[PDB]
């Protein structure tokens, strides 16, 4: 979004050094406050919206988990491989 | 540490033609042919010296090696220029 740019033969930096960014945010309950500060930083650049708030037409989403037994051949190959 | 003829090649080229440049590929090719011709002349002079049983290579050895290696017209002008250079150096004493 804000890269280093050359103007009139000179370089101008648009954004903080990656190392400084890592030092401030990446190094650290404090994680919640750091994430909140990150969100604050994004606030100019980022517009975030969620389906449930935006619309209520088709909320119906369902997730199911299926358990599968290994076939004798598959079981054998798995055991052998390990 | 190493050494190369590239500097002198650039110098002489500029003296012939200030506006023209050389890439490393061409520069290395030039260095290589200069090296090859130098080895050729030196080995010919070594042979001619050993054949006449002389231990000291000389202006004569190089003269005759250049006579042999270079084509006759190119040889004639090369020897002419070499003679001029040698005589001017000797006169510098």
């Amino acid at each position: 979004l804000m890269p280093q740019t050359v103007i009139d033969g000179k370089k101008v930096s648009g954004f903080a050094d990656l190392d400084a960014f890592q030092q401030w945010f990446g190094r650290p309950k404090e994680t919640k406050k750091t994430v909140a500060k990150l969100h604050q930083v994004l606030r100019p650049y980022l517009l975030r919206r969620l389906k449930a708030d935006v619309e209520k037409q088709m909320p119906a989403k369902y997730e199911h988990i299926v358990y599968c037994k290994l076939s004798k051949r598959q079981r054998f190959l798995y055991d052998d491989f390990m | 540490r190493k050494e190369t003829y590239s500097s002198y090649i650039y110098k002489v080229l500029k003296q012939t033609h200030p506006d023209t440049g050389i890439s490393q590929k061409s520069m290395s090719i030039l260095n290589s042919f200069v090296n090859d011709i130098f080895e050729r002349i030196a080995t010919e002079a070594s042979k001619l010296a050993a054949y006449n049983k002389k231990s000291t290579i000389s202006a004569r050895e190089i003269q005759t090696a250049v006579r042999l290696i270079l084509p006759g017209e190119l040889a004639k002008h090369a020897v002419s220029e070499g003679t001029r250079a040698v005589t001017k150096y000797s006169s510098s004493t």
């Binding site: 979004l1 804000m2 994004l42 100019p44 650049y45 980022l46 517009l47 975030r48 919206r49 969620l50 389906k51 935006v54 619309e55 | -």
Partner: protein, 91 residues
Amino acid sequence: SVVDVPVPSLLRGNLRTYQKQGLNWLASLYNNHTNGILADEMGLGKTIQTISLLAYLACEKENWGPHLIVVPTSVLLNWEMEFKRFAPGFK
């Protein structure tokens, strides 16, 4: 703050309210001369909002200049289709 910029006349179909809000926010970034990241929980109409932004650039700013969009291969044709659908005036 963000200004409720006029709806582009070139708009085909109905921008939903939230899509209008997103349009206005993009136009605000343009007026601020600032680049932006736009992340919607997928399936909200990012692409129609892109159309609406370009159309706002079209009506008010007259700037149909040669804009560039770089995109995965699969969605590319769908993008072409949606350009036809939402604003067929774009070459």
